[PDB]
Design a binder for this molecule. Structure first.
Ligand code: NI
Length: 341
């Protein structure tokens, strides 16, 4: 059954709750972003109102074939009325089209649901600065102090320098980037840009990118693999077997592959810096795991929450075990006692 952490009290609303069939009493289903664990269950046969960003709406239409009449896109940073309740969508700094949702309850309670987010100090100057938030439904993916990672900017700088050096030393080297969802487009676009290439990909993935309102996107991507020296492949194919295989397919246009696997966290984050990363190498093939995160580090999360000073926190990630639940509740209490709310 639909868990309580997916229901907004005092409304008929649910958030990211598309795989339970009809939810008794739901008059509007919100979708924070187009990632499969969140949209799971949506299809062309859905006949309830879906409220979401413009970009998420383009993906629902073109990739899922949900019918236009059930898609209600809203602009960001704008007070909107939905079934008699004032809401605002904010940028979540996750993947394209990902939002946080502010609900203003008839009784005066204000609720923020983060969806998936990477907290950033820039959020402290959005519409959230303007009033008190009583309840926070929080993306707790990396709610533990071992989770440190570098900035996105540092990680992209590393990837750009690595690629540029490799290809300048060997003009017959191929760069490959893995993907399995939207998100992390900066990795492959930043590399393609320093190499004066467009990025080449399958027709399904090109279609997905054409939904995302990226400016000048026609200048940056293509379905013609052979004209491009940055290829995207399914993340499953980023290993020696899948890469050697792939290399054959270019017909000896290339003699070397340099591949990036943008992971979330991996335990080498607890010992090594970005400047000190190394690849796995078998032959003319090298694979870099780079820690490009679209979720809050523990410190970014803690800062956000200590700024917001909510009355109650409802975790939406890692809620399945008593040990995780208990650990998270300890961190929330530390934060509250340190900051004095
Ligand atoms: Ni996500």
């Amino acid at each position: 059954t639909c868990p309580f952490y997916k229901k907004i009290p005092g409304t008929g609303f649910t958030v990211d709750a598309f795989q339970y069939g009809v939810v008794e009493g739901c008059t509007a289903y919100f979708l924070t972003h187009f990632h499969s664990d969140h949209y799971a269950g949506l299809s062309k046969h859905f006949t309830f109102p879906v409220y979401c960003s413009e970009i998420t709406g383009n993906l629902l239409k073109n990739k899922l074939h949900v019918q236009e009449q059930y898609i209600h896109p809203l602009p960001l940073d704008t007070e909107c009325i939905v079934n008699g309740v004032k809401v605002v969508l904010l940028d979540a700094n996750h993947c394209p089209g990902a939002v946080m949702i502010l609900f203003y309850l008839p009784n005066g309670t204000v609720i923020l649901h983060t969806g998936d987010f990477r907290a950033d100090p820039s959020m402290e100057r959005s519409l959230l600065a303007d009033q008190k938030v009583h309840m926070l439904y929080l993306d707790t993916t990396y709610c533990s102090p071992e989770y440190t990672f570098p900035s996105q900017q540092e990680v992209i700088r590393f990837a750009i320098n690595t690629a540029f050096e490799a290809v300048t030393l060997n003009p017959h080297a191929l760069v490959v980037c893995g993907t399995y969802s939207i998100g992390k487009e900066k990795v492959f676009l930043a590399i393609a840009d320093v190499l004066g290439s467009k990025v080449g990909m399958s027709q399904e993935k090109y279609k997905t990118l054409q939904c995302l309102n990226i400016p000048e996107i026609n200048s940056l991507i293509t379905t013609d693999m052979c004209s491009s020296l940055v290829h995207l492949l399914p993340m499953m194919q980023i290993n020696f077997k899948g890469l050697q295989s792939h290399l054959k397919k270019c017909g000896g246009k290339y003699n070397q592959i340099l591949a990036f696997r943008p992971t979330g966290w991996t335990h080498s984050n607890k010992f090594t810096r970005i400047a000190d990363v190394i690849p796995q190498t078998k032959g003319n093939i090298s694979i870099y795991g780079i820690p490009y995160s679209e979720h809050s580090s523990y410190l970014e999360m803690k800062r956000f929450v200590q700024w917001l000073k909510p009355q109650k926190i409802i975790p939406t990630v890692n809620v399945g075990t008593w040990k995780s639940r208990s650990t998270m509740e300890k961190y929330f209490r530390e934060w509250k006692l340190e900051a004095g709310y």
